Amino acid sequence: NAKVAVLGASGGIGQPLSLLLKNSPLVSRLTLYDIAHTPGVAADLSHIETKAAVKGYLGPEQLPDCLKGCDVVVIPAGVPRKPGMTRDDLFNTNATIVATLTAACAQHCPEAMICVIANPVNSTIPITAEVFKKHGVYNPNKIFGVTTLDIVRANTFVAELKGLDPARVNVPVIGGHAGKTIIPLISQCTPKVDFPQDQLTALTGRIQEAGTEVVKAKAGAGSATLSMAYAGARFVFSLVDAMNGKEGVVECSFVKSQETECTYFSTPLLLGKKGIEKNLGIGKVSSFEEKMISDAIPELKASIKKGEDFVKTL
Amino acid sequence: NAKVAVLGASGGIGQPLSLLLKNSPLVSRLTLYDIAHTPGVAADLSHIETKAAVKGYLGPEQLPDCLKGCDVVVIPAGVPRKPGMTRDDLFNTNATIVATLTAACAQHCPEAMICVIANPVNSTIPITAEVFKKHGVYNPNKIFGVTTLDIVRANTFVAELKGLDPARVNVPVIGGHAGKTIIPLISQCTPKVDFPQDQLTALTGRIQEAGTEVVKAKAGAGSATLSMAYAGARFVFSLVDAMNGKEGVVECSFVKSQETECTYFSTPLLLGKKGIEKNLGIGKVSSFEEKMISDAIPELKASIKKGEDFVKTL
Amino acid sequence: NAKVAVLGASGGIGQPLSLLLKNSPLVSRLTLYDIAHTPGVAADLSHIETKAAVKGYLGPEQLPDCLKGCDVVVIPAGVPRKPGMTRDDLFNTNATIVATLTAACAQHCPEAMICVIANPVNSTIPITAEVFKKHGVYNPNKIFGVTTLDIVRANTFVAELKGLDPARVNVPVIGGHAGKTIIPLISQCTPKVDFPQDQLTALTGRIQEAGTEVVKAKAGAGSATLSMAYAGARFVFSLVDAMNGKEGVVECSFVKSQETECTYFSTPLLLGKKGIEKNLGIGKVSSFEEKMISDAIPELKASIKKGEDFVKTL
Amino acid sequence: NAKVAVLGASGGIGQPLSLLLKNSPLVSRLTLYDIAHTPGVAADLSHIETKAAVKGYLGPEQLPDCLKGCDVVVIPAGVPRKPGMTRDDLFNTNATIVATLTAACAQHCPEAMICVIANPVNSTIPITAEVFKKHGVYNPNKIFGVTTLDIVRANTFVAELKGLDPARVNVPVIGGHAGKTIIPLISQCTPKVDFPQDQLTALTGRIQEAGTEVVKAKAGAGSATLSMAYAGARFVFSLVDAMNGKEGVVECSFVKSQETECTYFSTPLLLGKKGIEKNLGIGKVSSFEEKMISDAIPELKASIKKGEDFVKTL
Ligand SMILES: NC(=O)c1ccc[n+]([C@@H]2O[C@H](COP(=O)([O-])OP(=O)(O)OC[C@H]3O[C@@H](n4cnc5c(N)ncnc54)[C@H](O)[C@@H]3O)[C@@H](O)[C@H]2O)c1
Ligand SMILES: NC(=O)c1ccc[n+]([C@@H]2O[C@H](COP(=O)([O-])OP(=O)(O)OC[C@H]3O[C@@H](n4cnc5c(N)ncnc54)[C@H](O)[C@@H]3O)[C@@H](O)[C@H]2O)c1
Ligand SMILES: NC(=O)c1ccc[n+]([C@@H]2O[C@H](COP(=O)([O-])OP(=O)(O)OC[C@H]3O[C@@H](n4cnc5c(N)ncnc54)[C@H](O)[C@@H]3O)[C@@H](O)[C@H]2O)c1
């Protein structure tokens, strides 16, 4: 029964994400928004034999109509990286995009869950919060930075190394979504896994620089699109399940947090009807994992402040 | 346990198709092929938390290694339409692509199920058959023209007009995949539906021109990609289920046929372990539907002859 | 003192063509039209330090304002070929595009010179003629099928083989613009050149299939764009010089002709203030060249009929 | 006559640039390089009826053959901006592209004039210089950051305000190529123009934001391509004229400079047979202009160091 808007639906992530949402029995209305090509994408998907009604919207004059009555908004809108770039190279362009779109959300569907994919997530979530505070509708239990792909990657890499089935593996990943701020808690992995430190370190780095590995492999043709569509769909489904009374639903996500001195931080969250039911916190961790958390905090706070300062100039 | 090859994996269809395939526990190995961009696509999908081992292959030199050991090969490789073009206007270009790709298949995975998505399907399937014949490995039970999107469109459109869930609608569509050769048997629809003749004609025209509807809506940005990825994934899943011994798997598909004077024709096929188990035939049809079959045959024969003639000059 | 419109200005040919026109002191006003990207292209071109004022127009609502007061219209709007395509595969698409765009010309700038680049020229010139008839403003001295690239190619190749400066070479090319209908009158070449019949035949084939060789070299990335921009700029410059009263300006172009049983035909044309001042005809030719003319006529008639037929259907 | 290499010849700037170079009687040989599409672009251009011999090169193995014997190398290779990006946001991607390509030039055509178009120019010229130093062939009189488009824009905008022929306007533009580092010296314009202050300020700002204006207008489809092709060609032609012994050839360009405290800086340069004959300096400026120089210096030094540092960490 959920009504989901996808802002940036014509892009690399947007189209396959919209596909996965259209294919879901959980979605009864799918509104697609972009600045280009949205009508053709909507017609394409409207032919698929599922109940979700698909409507496409094009340009800022139609963004309000796209947002009317939505339960979840997902925002893959933004520019992807080229080889060599950092996520902060995209900050200027994507901060404007995220601020503009989340402003419309605050105006026209303030009650909706806001799921931000656009990078750098470590800054774009603070931006979303400060835009919502600006319109006086800020609810910290309903704004999510989608880090799900870090968890998905962690599970895959663990499963390959130990010959396990990825569907059975679960690795909490905490901190943020950029380089050393991505902290995989291999010591909390279910099932339990033992690696020597050199292999643990190699696995940790692989997970951290996984996005960059894909940017290099694509050689100028963009960043992770299909896996991020999978990761975004997964997160939305988790959130909607929880919204229909499903219990025990847990997903890591970068949110407003009091667990560390960072005002925003990613930890496992129990999800409920009002978004975040309970922040489950960092929990018990190794020395190696404590070192990474401690090392990640300055970069996190700098990014958090960079997003806040950007909204301050609006 | 099914090893699936996608030829044309970097395209508008190939990428979301490859995603849907990667997401399924029916696929144990997903080998992707194209003339550009495949390594990045493979890198992207390899991070998804499912069992399928994803490998990428690039250029004619690597095509044999993409195909070896394959159970299924799907071929979305081909040029799509621009507004104003017929599917037949693509023949010359796409003919050479299908012939070359299917020759490698006949040489390197002759036992595999061959699923051609490339247009015009009415001519490209005959090209595939003649190519396989030329190499002495022609099995008419394993060569499939993917017409599934026509069925998906029919189901959806009927479901919309009757207020039904399209997940529990099934309209057999027969003939071929081009204009008037697309024949939806609404008389055989489950559940039973009865339209007056004025509406039935419009519904029938809508289904026939659905592909062109998406072409115009995309205004030169290509044809159906996401819905075709859906339809193609469904057909492969149906085919892989049947190969795993699942019973009652029925799909319409343009295949080597003796149901009419046409050498190739689409009807509901019972699929099994060896490919086509039994052609379920045209069945009991209305006068209206009987006229369309009669009207379609000359065009289908021409399209078939065109395809056969192309291989004759190789 | 000439106001020129480019219809299809955002395309592969359109952009470099518009650039060459912008650079010319013959052009005082340049209006650019497309269905996509025009404002960005016009903004880019308007920064160049030449006198021509540039303005961009997007979509059919802005087409009339583009054409008002136009002295010359050049029409590269259309779909180019992929490898394997015949020029007739693009007929249905381009015929529609040419018909639409020439109707607006007929209504809004009926006295303007109409230079059609869009293929197949052998049919799109007939289409342009009939559309102009419907609106009661047909003038056959102002409608030009741009075949200049063929002449340009012929000059380059003859110069290459003979070690000449291509600026000092002129080869009349007659007939039409497709395959064997492209007839280089090497016997009329200035300066005089002497080839054995074997070299002459291969050279003649090279000229006829030149467009195809470029399509092959681009491997799906399109057809001749930069060389066509050059050729189209040359023809437009020739025409605008003649319109300003320059004498002895001669260009081959595909036009309304009584030189043969074909109703449209390309021969060298004396241009002047009314457009076509005098058709210079075929002249004396070799037996070899007479043979090619004879063989080409059936193709030309067919192509002329096809375009004329298409217009009746609107 | 001049042998000119274009690195990044298949791009938006590279292709039209290559066309302008091909059309010019000052070019005897045109060698084109890119990582994709080069052979198609070269085949296309090789049909144009000018004397310049055109050859296309593709991939690292063929780069040296492209550079051998070159008098001038133009390097448009690089990633363009999207809306909201600064030129500096392209640094991390384009630093490696410029470093590689200029290392190739240092090896294979060290005596050639090196014209860097790739952004950010304020940092990529220092990169170029440091790469030539590493190779022991650094000649500061032959390394040029192409700022010519800023001058072209200034000439055009001044001519539009005053109602002049832009062919007769020359505005020196100094400093660098980004935002407030672009300093148009309207007080040194020929002919002398007197502007009311409100127009002068809006003019100055227009010149500085012109690049961003075009990026905005292209709405994600790149940056200035056609006007940059015009400007880069103009610069090459001035360079070749001066190489052929023409006197009084002056062009502004971002070069090694001892005019301010910035080690690199753009001023009018008298060009001669060996590149820079003489840096003509800042000359006499107004207070308004002196202040713009003062404000620009901190940003220039920062962009310079950024470029130098990049090379020292290799
Ligand atoms: N959170 C993650 O783990 C994660 C992973 C991968 C990528 N990303 C980010 O997702 C974003 C999108 O990546 P992509 O590959 O889809 O890029 P893309 O260029 O393929 O698509 C971007 C889409 O956003 C649209 N867009 C741009 N401005 C818009 C606006 N103002 N309003 C509405 N739509 C607008 C574009 O038109 C395009 O359709 C990037 O910022 C990328 O860095 C995040
Ligand atoms: N059966 C149907 O109902 C149906 C529906 C939609 C589209 N189609 C057809 O599917 C085909 C693909 O459509 P699309 O939208 O993905 O086009 P696309 O242009 O987006 O991608 C097609 C892909 O084919 C690849 N390709 C071309 N030649 C190749 C070769 N020789 N070897 C390997 N790869 C090659 C291209 O690189 C490209 O990645 C088209 O022919 C279209 O007509 C069929
Ligand atoms: N005369 C010749 O010798 C010759 C040579 C080469 C190419 N051509 C023809 O040139 C034409 C285009 O070539 P290209 O390489 O520029 O193709 P392209 O695809 O690069 O550009 C085509 C442009 O036409 C535009 N367009 C399409 N429909 C339009 C419409 N209805 N109104 C306005 N604009 C429209 C598109 O938006 C695009 O910008 C083709 O038809 C090709 O066959 C002719």
Ligand SMILES: NC(=O)c1ccc[n+]([C@@H]2O[C@H](COP(=O)([O-])OP(=O)(O)OC[C@H]3O[C@@H](n4cnc5c(N)ncnc54)[C@H](O)[C@@H]3O)[C@@H](O)[C@H]2O)c1
């Ligand atoms: N100096 C100026 O005023 C000015 C003006 C406009 C643009 N620019 C800069 O020029 C570049 C814009 O170029 P464009 O608009 O043609 O972009 P584009 O994307 O259209 O083309 C860039 C070209 O770079 C090529 N390339 C990338 N890496 C390469 C490599 N390693 N070796 C050889 N070629 C490589 C690509 O293949 C492509 O052909 C950007 O750096 C942009 O910032 C400068």
